[PDB]
């Protein structure tokens, strides 16, 4: 399986905060997708991150959010910036291993809350 652990509250002071998901698998040298969203109805996708063996942490956005690429041993880190007041909502983490098939996902990773 895969399990996910992240903060229960993180007040983004001055539109600046760091969000991280504690992932559970081997060190590195595989292929993956570690997504981040906003809403349980999948209202928004905020960022998603993958890196090849040599190729570094590829990082982009699909609703124009600000995202940097940071990776450690078996943990991810999201450098999110440029926040607002209304989009304050719950934030959840996602994971999907590919090799091997099939995929035995995690329960809904509890997530985090921001201000």
């Amino acid at each position, epitope marked *: 399986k895969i399990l996910v652990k992240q903060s229960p509250m993180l007040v983004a002071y001055d539109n600046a905060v760091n969000l991280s998901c504690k992932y559970s698998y081997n060190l590195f040298s595989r292929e993956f*997708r570690a997504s981040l969203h906003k809403g349980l109805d999948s209202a928004v996708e905020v960022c998603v991150v*993958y890196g090849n063996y040599s190729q570094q942490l590829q990082v982009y956005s*699909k*609703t*124009g959010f600000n995202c940097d690429g940071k990776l450690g041993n078996e943990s991810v880190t999201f450098y999110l910036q440029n926040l607002y007041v209304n989009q304050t909502d719950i934030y959840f983490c996602k994971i999907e291993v590919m090799y091997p*098939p099939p995929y035995l996902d995690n329960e809904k990773s509890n997530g985090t809350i921001i201000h």
Partner: antibody
Amino acid sequence: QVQLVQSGAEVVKPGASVKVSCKASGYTFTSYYIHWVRQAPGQGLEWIGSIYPGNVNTNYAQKFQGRATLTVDTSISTAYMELSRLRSDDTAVYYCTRSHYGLDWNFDVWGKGTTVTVSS
Amino acid sequence: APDIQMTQSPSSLSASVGDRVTITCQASQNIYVWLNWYQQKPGKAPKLLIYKASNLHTGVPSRFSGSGSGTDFTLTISSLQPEDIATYYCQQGQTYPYTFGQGTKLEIKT
């Protein structure tokens, strides 16, 4: 040999469905988010849905949900498209196109298209 | 939240062989960068030309360049050639649903 073998010249009345085939090979069939794209003669192309065994949850187009039905099979690396209740305005040239790995923004290799004509 | 609108002009032009042709691609919403240029001669399978706003997709000569500073990007064909006789397309890729479905049919001039 990184391509998509498409089905043959299939033609039937309106309202009846159609089962299309798209065999994949030369790469990881179990990735890359197979798509389907039909070409209505008179204007450009179209889009219906993306498909992956992992996220068979509902991600289609507005007047497409309930009508199209995408499937796959890893044992022979094949994808199938099945449009139902085919109205006359559904006549088009259907393609299966492949997105890049884990993403969907570019279409990598396009299927060789399909003869799909309906009339009267 | 009505999907997306993709405008491509023209439906068909008549440009000579070798003339610099640069076809535009405009949207009604704010797609930061999700354009995809599909060379599609009328009849054959679509051929992706550039897998970004302006990024040379492999298998396509170094003359198929693009450009754009802001909301509306473009594509710069330096020299028009005989194999470019096609119906060009640009894709959007930010939110579902998806319809490029316009057609810029570059017909030959004589």
